[PDB]
C-alpha cells in the first residue's frame, strides 16, 4: 500500500544524455543510435532572442561548429539538419547504450517522467503532467534545455517531451521529439503567456479511485449525477470537461472498486462544494490531478482494501 | 524556476538489482562486487513467520537452494551467511556494474530515493524521508521486499535502506544494509504498530525557504522569536524540537533570503496557530516536511551526478 508520485527508473535515459555546445551556449542533447537531438535555439546569439531566422543561422554553421561531449568523450558531428524546432546532429558513433525507444506526442492530462540535466549530466528525476494549457509545472534552471520527458511502459522508452523554455509565470514549454511545440508557443523570446490553466478532471477521479483502493471511503456519498450536470458544476471550479471517453477509461477502476463513474463524479462535486474539513486524501489536503487512470492501475494493488 | 519532489537519477542502482528465489518466495536483492544482499525473511515459510529461528532455517539450506537471476543470467551462489536481518549470498561473479558505493545509516528527518523493484526489475523511483517514528511513507506491493533506498553524494552511491515489510497503518519498515532495523521493529509476521509520528521542523523551515526563493512570500511577517518560545509552540503542535544545530544548518538559506531562522520560525508559528487562510505554498495546503535543507539548496542550484 501507499501512494506516491512515482517516476520511471531513469537509467535508460541517463545513458543517452550528452552536452551540446555552439559558440558560448551549452545545453543538453539526447543521443540515440547515431543522432543527437537538441533544441534549435542552441544556435542563437544575443542578437537572435526576439526574431531568429533559424534557416539563416544554420546555413552559416559547419559540422565542426557543434561540440558534442558524451561523458569525457568528444563525438564527431558528421551532419546536421533541423526538423521543426529541434536540431538533429548526425555523429560518427552509434550510442552503445541506446535503449529500445519510440517518439510519441502526448495529449493534455498525460503524465511523464522528467530527467533534469545540466551540462549533459543528470540532476534528478520527477513526474510531470502536460497541463490543459500545454505547459508543464517543472523544476528547471538555466542550462536545463534539452532535458527530456519520457515513459517506460515495458522495456521501451517513449520520449514525449524536450525542454525549451520558461514562461513568465514560471511554468515550462517544450516540444515533442519531432520538434513540434506543445501549445501555441514559439522558440522566440517575445511576449508569450500560457492560457488560464484548468484542473484535469479525469485524473482527479482516478486519484479518488486510488484512495478507495487503498482503503479510504470518507468522501463518498449516496448520490449520483448525470454527465451533463457534473460538467456544468465542474466548469464553475475551473475543471476540464469530462467526456464519455474519460468515463470509458475509468471503467476498470470503477469495476475494481464497485463505485460507478457517475457516483464518483457526485463525490467530486461534493468535495468541490465542501472542501476537506480538516481531512486528507492519500496524504493531500488538495485534490491531486497529476495521476492518470493508467498510473493508478500501474501503482495500486489490483485487490481493493475493503 | 519551480520546485518539485525530486529523486536521484537511479541508473547506478538499477544495474545492481537482481531477483532472489528461495522455495516459493521471490524478492529482490542488491548485487555489489561478489555479494547479493537481501532480507533474511526470504528463507521463511508460512509456519515459521510467527516466531522464526533464522539460524535454524538457514542451516538447512545449500548454496543451490538460492536461485539468483541478473536479468536473464543465473548467478552461481558459492556461500551464504547472515548479518543481522540481511542475508549475504556470495556469488561466483563480481557485478561489473558495481558503482562506487558506501553503506550508511541515516537519521530521522533525512531523505533518500527509493527504487521500487519487483522480480529484480526496477519499476519506479520516488523520494522518501525517514520519519521521526522510523517508518517511511512509501509505495510498495507484494514482491517489493529488498528494494533499496539511497543518496548520491558525488559519484558515490550511499545505500541507506532495504525494504522488509508493511505495518498495519500502510507505512513501511526496513533496515540499513548492515541489516539493523530503523525503529523498534522485528522481522516476523506479528502485531507491530508504528509509534505516533511528529513533523520534521527543520525540513518545514527549509521548504518555507524554498517557497521564498521561488517567489512565494505571503506568510512572511515583521516578527521574530526565540528558540525557547518557538520550541514551546513546536511541542504543542507535535513538531520536533528545533536545535541550534538546525539553526546553523539553515544559515545559508537565511543569508540568501534575508529571513533569519527565528524570523522564519515566527512565520511558522503563525501558520501553526492560524492555518493558511485559504492560501497555498508551493502548491500545497499543508506544510511539507520531506525536503531537507541540503535538498532545497541542491535543487535551487542544479548539482548533477
Ligand atoms: C516482500 N517481498 C514481500 N512480499 C510479500 N510479502 C508479505 C509476506 O511474504 C511477508 O513474509 C514474512 C515477512 C517477515 Cl518481516 C517475516 C517472515 C515472513 Cl514469512 N513481503
Ligand atoms: C536552456 N538551457 C536555457 N538556459 C538559459 N536559457 C535562457 C536563454 O538562453 C534562452 O535563449 C533563447 C530561447 C529561445 Cl526559446 C529562443 C532564443 C533564445 Cl536566444 N535557456
Ligand atoms: Cl518581534
Ligand atoms: Na517574521
CATH number, domain containing residue A32: 2.40.10.10
Entry field: residues in chain B: 305
Residues of A in contact with B144 (CB under 8 A): none
- Experimental technique used? X-ray
Residue A176 belongs to a domain? yes
Q: How crowded is residue A73: how many other Cβ atoms within 10 Å of its Cβ?
A: 9
The response to whether residue A143 sits with its C-beta less than 6 Å from ligand 2 reads yes
Which of A54, A82, A145, A187 is the pocket-test mutation for ligand 2 (most atoms within 8 Å of CB)? A145
Q: Is A145 a catalytic residue?
A: yes
Same-domain check for residues A3 and A37: no
Catalytic status, residue A300: no
Residues B181 and B106 occupy one common structural domain: yes
Q: Are A296 and A226 within one domain?
A: yes
Q: Which helix (H) or strand (E) holds B117?
A: strand B111-118
Question: What residues of chain A lie within 8 A of the CB of B303, using their CB?
Answer: 123
Find the discontinuities in chain A where C to next N exceeds 2.5 angstroms and give the residue preceding each: none
CB B50 within 8 A of CB B189: yes
CA of B290 to the centre of ligand 3 (A): 28
Q: Residue A84 is placed in which grid cell?
A: 521543426
Yes or no: say if B114 and B147 are a contact pair by the CB < 8 Å rule: yes
- Backbone dihedral angles phi then psi of residue B219, each to the nearest 5 degrees: -90, -10
Q: How far is the CA of B67 from the centre of ligand 2 (A)?
A: 52
With both helix axes pointing from N to C terminus, report the angle between B201-213 and B261-274 in degrees, rounded to the nearest 10. Answer: 100
* Residue A153 and residue A46 share a domain: no
Cβ neighbours for B31, distance < 8 A, ≥ 6 positions apart: B16, B17, B18, B68, B70, B75, B91, B95, B98
Same domain, A236 and A266: yes
Q: What is the DSSP letter of B74?
A: E
CATH number at residue A258: 1.10.1840.10
Beta carbons within 10 angstroms of residue A235's beta carbon: 13
Strand, helix or coil at A26?
Answer: strand
A193 lies in the same domain as A211 = no
Whether B234 and B291 map to the same domain: the answer is yes
Which of B16, B41, B160, B265 is an active site residue? B41
Rounded to the nearest 10°, the torsion over CA A219, A257, A205, B278 is: 20
Which residues contact ligand 1 via a Cβ below 6 A?
Answer: B 27, 41, 44, 49, 52, 142-145, 164-165, 187-189
Question: How far is it, in rounded angstroms, from Cα A132 to Cα B297?
Answer: 31
Examine the domain organization and report whether A293 and A209 are in the same domain.
yes
Ligand 2 contacts CB of residue A164 (under 6 A): yes
Taking alpha carbons only, the member of A177, A143, A139, A115 closest to residue A42 is A143
Q: Is the CB of A93 under 6 A from ligand 2?
A: no
Distant-in-sequence contacts of B178-184, Cβ < 8 A, 24+ apart: B178/B83, B178/B84, B178/B86, B178/B103, B178/B105, B179/B40, B179/B82, B179/B83, B179/B84, B179/B85, B179/B86, B180/B84, B180/B85, B180/B105, B181/B85, B181/B134, B182/B130, B182/B134, B182/B135, B183/B133, B183/B134, B183/B135, B184/B134
**Where is the domain boundary, A174, A197, A220?**
A197
Residue B103 grid coordinates? 553503506
Single residue among B99, B122, B157 that ends a domain in this structure:
B99
Choosing from B16, B128, B145, B265, which is the catalytic residue? B145
Residue A143 shares a structural domain with residue A110: yes
Q: Which residue, of B52, B67, B99, is where some domain finishes?
A: B99
Q: Which of B252, B283, B294, B246 is nearest to B4 (CA)?
A: B283
B8 with B145, same domain: the answer is yes
Q: Is residue A283 part of a domain?
A: yes
- Together in a domain, A2 and A119: yes
The domain total for chain A is 3
With contact defined as beta carbons under 8 Å apart, do B4 and A129 qualify? no
Full residue range of the structural domain in which residue B208 is found: 198-301
Q: Which residues surround ligand 3, an ion (CB under 5 A)?
A: B 223-224
Look up cell 481493493; give the residue: A304
Does residue A226 fall inside a structural domain?
yes
A120: left (phi over 0), alpha (psi -120 to 50) or beta: left
Atom 20 of ligand 2: nearest residue by CA position = A142
State the smallest CA–CA distance between residue A195 and chain B in angstroms. 18
**Nearest chain A CA: its distance from B255 CA (Å):** 21
Do B271 and B216 sit in the same domain of this protein?
yes
Amino acid at each position: 500500500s501507499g501512494f506516491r508520485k512515482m517516476a520511471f527508473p531513469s537509467g535508460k535515459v541517463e545513458g543517452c544524455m550528452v552536452q551540446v555546445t555552439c559558440g558560448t551556449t551549452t545545453l543538453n542533447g539526447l543521443w540515440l543510435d547515431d543522432v543527437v537531438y537538441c533544441p534549435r535555439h542552441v544556435i542563437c546569439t544575443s542578437e537572435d532572442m526576439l526574431n531568429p531566422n533559424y534557416e539563416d543561422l544554420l546555413i552559416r554553421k559547419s559540422n565542426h561548429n557543434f561540440l558534442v561531449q558524451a561523458g569525457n568523450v568528444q563525438l564527431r558531428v558528421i551532419g546536421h539538419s533541423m526538423q521543426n524546432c529541434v536540431l538533429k546532429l548526425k555523429v560518427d558513433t552509434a550510442n552503445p547504450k541506446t535503449p529500445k525507444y519510440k517518439f510519441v506526442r502526448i495529449q493534455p492530462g498525460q503524465t511523464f517522467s522528467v530527467l533534469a540535466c545540466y551540462n549533459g549530466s543528470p540532476s534528478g528525476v520527477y513526474q510531470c503532467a502536460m497541463r490543459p494549457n500545454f505547459t508543464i509545472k517543472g523544476s528547471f534552471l538555466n542550462g536545463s534545455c534539452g532535458s527530456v520527458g519520457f515513459n517506460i511502459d515495458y522495456d521501451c522508452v517513449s520520449f514525449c517531451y524536450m525542454h525549451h523554455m520558461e514562461l513568465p509565470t514560471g511554468v515550462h514549454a517544450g516540444t515533442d521529439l519531432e520538434g513540434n511545440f506543445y501549445g501555441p508557443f514559439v522558440d522566440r523570446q517575445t511576449a508569450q503567456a500560457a492560457g488560464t490553466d484548468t484542473t484535469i478532471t479525469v485524473n482527479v477521479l482516478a486519484w479518488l479511485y486510488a484512495a478507495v483502493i487503498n482503503g479510504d471511503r470518507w468522501f463518498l456519498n449516496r448520490f449520483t449525477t448525470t454527465l451533463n450536470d457534473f460538467n456544468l458544476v465542474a466548469m464553475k471550479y475551473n475543471y476540464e470537461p469530462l467526456t464519455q471517453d474519460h468515463v470509458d477509461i475509468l471503467g476498470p477502476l470503477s469495476a475494481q472498486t464497485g463505485i460507478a463513474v457517475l457516483d464518483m463524479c457526485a463525490s467530486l462535486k461534493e468535495l468541490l462544494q465542501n472542501g476537506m474539513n480538516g481531512r486528507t486524501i492519500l496524504g493531500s489536503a488538495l485534490l491531486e490531478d497529476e495521476f492518470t487512470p493508467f498510473d493508478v492501475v500501474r501503482q495500486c494493488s489490483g485487490v481493493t482494501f475493503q
